[PDB]
């Protein structure tokens, strides 16, 4: 994705939308890269598992190739620094971005009509929360104990 600087951001949100000028954006006018311009006379749009975005024009029975939508792969996924919107910008620990066609070079495929759900299991988070809350309780108890120690020491 192109930020207003001319830099690069990267998002796993493919709920793409059409602006007034036809460029493909993602929830914020983020003009995707490389530049992709949906035609005005679009009837239906398709995006294969190799990322070619092609549209149905009126009258013509052919999906003209309007753009190509390749992915970007980093050697360290964890290193990314989020800036909100589920966007991540390149950083020194993430590694240089490798821009490549979907399906190849270790990348994935592009599925139309799907949204990827968050990888958060409620049960795991709740058991984690129980553990953490007990630890929090014990730590506040320790703080209060030191408080009592000091205030008695001064009562001396």
């Amino acid at each position: 994705v192109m930020l207003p600087d001319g830099t690069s951001a990267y998002t796993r949100d493919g709920s793409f939308q059409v602006d007034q000028n036809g460029q493909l954006v993602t929830a914020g006018g983020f003009q995707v890269q490389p530049a992709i311009t949906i035609p005005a006379n679009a009837l239906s749009i398709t995006i294969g598992r190799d990322g070619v975005v092609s549209v149905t024009q009126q009258g013509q029975a052919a999906p003209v190739q309007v753009g190509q939508l390749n992915l970007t792969t980093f050697m360290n996924d964890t290193g990314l620094e989020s800036i909100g919107e589920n966007l991540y910008i390149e950083t020194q620990s993430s590694g240089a971005p490798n821009e490549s066609t979907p399906g190849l070079n270790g990348a994935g495929l592009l599925y139309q009509g799907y949204v990827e759900t968050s990888n958060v299991n409620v049960a795991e988070e709740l058991v984690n929360m129980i553990q953490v809350q007990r630890a929090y309780e014990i730590n506040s108890k320790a703080v209060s104990t030191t408080d009592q120690m000091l205030q008695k020491l001064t009562q001396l």
Binding site: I130, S140, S144
Partner: protein
């Protein structure tokens, strides 16, 4: 609902008192209670689909009723004569629903112009549904002209008027899934609710 109850669980976790934190012996209780409401929501919607499927089933299986003739609410009775020689005058049977039994039941049959052509006394009719077949003859005993006639049924018990609703016989042509469903399209009369349909002949 399930989402809106998680926020009230997320709010407490991120707003619990820092130096006096809440007890930890409710998280699985509350979630199970939250999961109870979510389970009923899945139940509640699925029952509605069952209701729709039952409505569709009632709409179907009614080709026999379409082929047959039924009596529907209304004051209309059709009288006709066959094209064959010596044909007996035919008259659409009617009926009346009585919430309470009545001792004096009067059926006034009038032409389309409103003039009373026939007056009949039925007598005692108990609570329920009663059916009758008009002879197609007016008061003087002559056969009425072929056409539509209006029937007014008055049922009273000991001088106290009771609800008497005359019924109309018509031929069924189709079964309609309208705004609610189960409508009995008959043609000139229109659509009729299957529940309000009286009997099938």
């Amino acid at each position: 609902l399930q989402s809106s109850f998680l926020t009230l669980l997320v709010a407490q976790l991120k707003n619990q008192d820092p130096t006096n934190p809440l007890q930890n012996n409710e998280l699985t209780t509350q979630l199970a209670q939250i999961s109870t409401v979510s389970g009923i929501e899945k139940l509640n919607t699925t029952l509605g689909a069952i209701s729709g499927q039952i409505d569709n089933s009632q709409s179907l299986q009614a080709t026999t009723l379409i082929g047959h003739g039924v009596m529907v609410p209304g004051t209309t009775i059709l009288a006709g004569k066959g094209a064959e020689e010596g044909a007996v005058t035919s008259t659409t049977p009617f009926g009346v629903e009585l919430q309470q039994p009545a001792d004096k039941v009067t059926a006034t049959i009038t032409d389309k112009d409103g003039r009373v052509v026939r007056t009949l006394e039925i007598g005692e009719l108990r609570a329920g549904v009663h059916t009758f077949t008009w002879d197609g003859k007016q008061t003087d005993g002559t056969t009425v002209p072929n056409g539509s006639y209006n029937i007014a049924i008055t049922a009273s018990n000991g001088g106290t008027q009771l609800v008497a609703q005359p019924l109309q016989f018509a031929l069924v042509q189709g079964v309609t899934k309208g705004s609610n469903g189960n409508l009995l399209d008959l043609g000139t009369y229109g659509t009729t609710t299957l529940d309000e349909v009286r009997q099938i002949i």
